[PDB]
C-alpha cells in the first residue's frame, strides 16, 4: 500500500471515531515516529487554528487536501452550518481525505472535490452555488498559488476581507505569490514564521487579506 493508506489505517486504529482532535494527534504521531508526510502539521496547524478562530469563516475553500489533515483541523473549528470545500488533484488522496473526514465525523461540513484547481475554480459559482469565499487555504502546487489567486479574483470569488492563508511560503517556497501579494495594494499581508511539518526547518504561513480592486 501507500504512505497515505498507512496514515489512514493508523488513524482508524489509533484514534476515536468522531473525535477530530484524536485524528490530528494520530496523524502527527505517525508522521513524527514512522513516516514524514506533507500534512500542515501541529506547529503551523496551531497558527491556522488561531486564524480560523479569529475570523470564524462561514465558507472556506482549501486548495490541496492531501490526506485531510488541514480539512479536519479547520472543519473542527467551524461554527454550526459553516462549510469547507476542499480540492484534491490526486484521486487516491481524495478518497483518503473523504475517509479521514468520515472517521472524524466531519463529513457533513466538508465537500471534497477531486480535480485540478484551474479546472474547478471556474465552476464554484454555478455548480457549487458559491457567491464569495470568506477564507482560502492555499496548500496545493506551489507554482499555482499566484495564478489561482488571480483566477479567484477574475471569477468574482473574493470579497473585501477575504482571508488568504498560504502554507509553505518558505519551503518549498512560493516566491512569485509572496512578491505579488506583498507588493499589491489589494492585499494586506502578515507573515507567521514557523517550521516545516515534523522538521526543524523554518517555514511559514502568509496571511493576505483581500482589499477589493
Ligand atoms: C485541486 C488541485 C489540488 C492540488 C493539490 N492537491 N494536493 C496537493 C499537495 C501540494 N503540497 C506540496 O507539494 C507540499 C510539499 C511539501 C514539501 C515536500 C518536500 C520537501 F522536501 C519539503 C516540503 C510540504 C508541504 O506542506 C506541501 O504542502 N496539491 C493541485 C492542483 N490542483
Ligand atoms: Cl494537510
Ligand atoms: Cl509539526
Ligand atoms: Mg503544505
From Swiss-Prot:
Keywords: Catecholamine metabolism, Cell membrane, Cytoplasm, Lipid metabolism, Magnesium, Membrane, Metal-binding, Methyltransferase, Neurotransmitter degradation, Phosphoprotein, S-adenosyl-L-methionine, Signal-anchor, Transferase, Transmembrane, Transmembrane helix. Its cofactor is Mg(2+). Residues 1-213 are extracellular. It comes from the Eukaryota. Binds 1 Mg(2+) ion per subunit. Substrate binds at residues 142, 168, 197. GO terms for biological process: artery development; behavioral fear response; catecholamine catabolic process; catecholamine metabolic process; cellular response to cocaine; cellular response to phosphate starvation; cerebellar cortex morphogenesis; cholesterol efflux. It catalyses: a catechol + S-adenosyl-L-methionine = a guaiacol + S-adenosyl-L-homocysteine + H(+); 2-hydroxyestrone + S-adenosyl-L-methionine = 2-hydroxy-3-methoxy-estrone + S-adenosyl-L-homocysteine + H(+); 4-hydroxyestrone + S-adenosyl-L-methionine = 4-methoxyestrone + S-adenosyl-L-homocysteine + H(+); 2-hydroxyestrone + S-adenosyl-L-methionine = 2-methoxyestrone + S-adenosyl-L-homocysteine + H(+). The N-terminus is blocked. Its EC number is 2.1.1.6. Mg(2+) binds at residues 139, 167-168. The keyword Cell membrane applies. One of its GO terms (molecular function) is magnesium ion binding. S-adenosyl-L-methionine binds at residues 40, 62, 70, 88-89, 115-118, 139. One of its GO terms (cellular component) is membrane. Catalyzes the O-methylation, and thereby the inactivation, of catecholamine neurotransmitters and catechol hormones. Also shortens the biological half-lives of certain neuroactive drugs, like L-DOPA, alpha-methyl DOPA and isoproterenol. Belongs to the class I-like SAM-binding methyltransferase superfamily. Cation-dependent O-methyltransferase family. This is Catechol O-methyltransferase. The chain holds residues 46 to 258 of 264 of the full protein.
Amino acid at each position: 500500500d501507500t504512505k497515505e493508506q498507512r496514515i489512514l489505517r493508523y488513524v482508524q486504529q489509533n484514534a476515536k471515531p468522531g473525535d477530530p482532535q484524536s485524528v490530528l494527534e494520530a496523524i502527527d504521531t505517525y508522521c513524527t515516529q514512522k513516516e514524514w508526510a506533507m500534512n500542515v502539521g501541529d506547529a503551523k496547524g496551531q497558527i491556522m487554528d488561531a486564524v480560523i478562530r479569529e475570523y470564524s469563516p462561514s465558507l472556506v475553500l482549501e486548495l490541496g487536501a492531501y490526506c485531510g489533515y488541514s480539512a479536519v483541523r479547520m472543519a473542527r473549528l467551524l461554527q454550526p452550518g459553516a462549510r469547507l470545500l476542499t480540492m484534491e488533484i490526486n484521486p487516491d488522496c481524495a478518497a483518503i481525505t473523504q475517509q479521514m473526514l468520515n472517521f472524524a465525523g466531519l463529513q457533513d461540513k466538508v465537500t471534497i472535490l477531486n480535480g485540478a484547481s484551474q479546472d474547478l475554480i471556474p465552476q464554484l459559482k454555478k455548480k457549487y452555488d458559491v457567491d464569495t469565499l470568506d477564507m482560502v487555504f492555499l496548500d496545493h502546487w506551489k507554482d499555482r498559488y499566484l495564478p489561482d489567486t488571480l483566477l479567484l479574483e477574475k471569477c468574482g470569488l473574493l470579497r473585501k476581507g477575504t482571508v488568504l492563508l498560504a502554507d509553505n511560503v518558505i519551503v518549498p517556497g512560493t516566491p512569485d505569490f509572496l512578491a505579488y501579494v506583498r507588493g499589491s495594494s489589494s492585499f494586506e499581508c502578515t507573515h507567521y514564521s514557523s517550521y516545516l511539518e515534523y522538521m526543524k526547518v523554518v517555514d511559514g504561513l502568509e496571511k493576505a487579506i483581500y482589499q477589493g480592486p
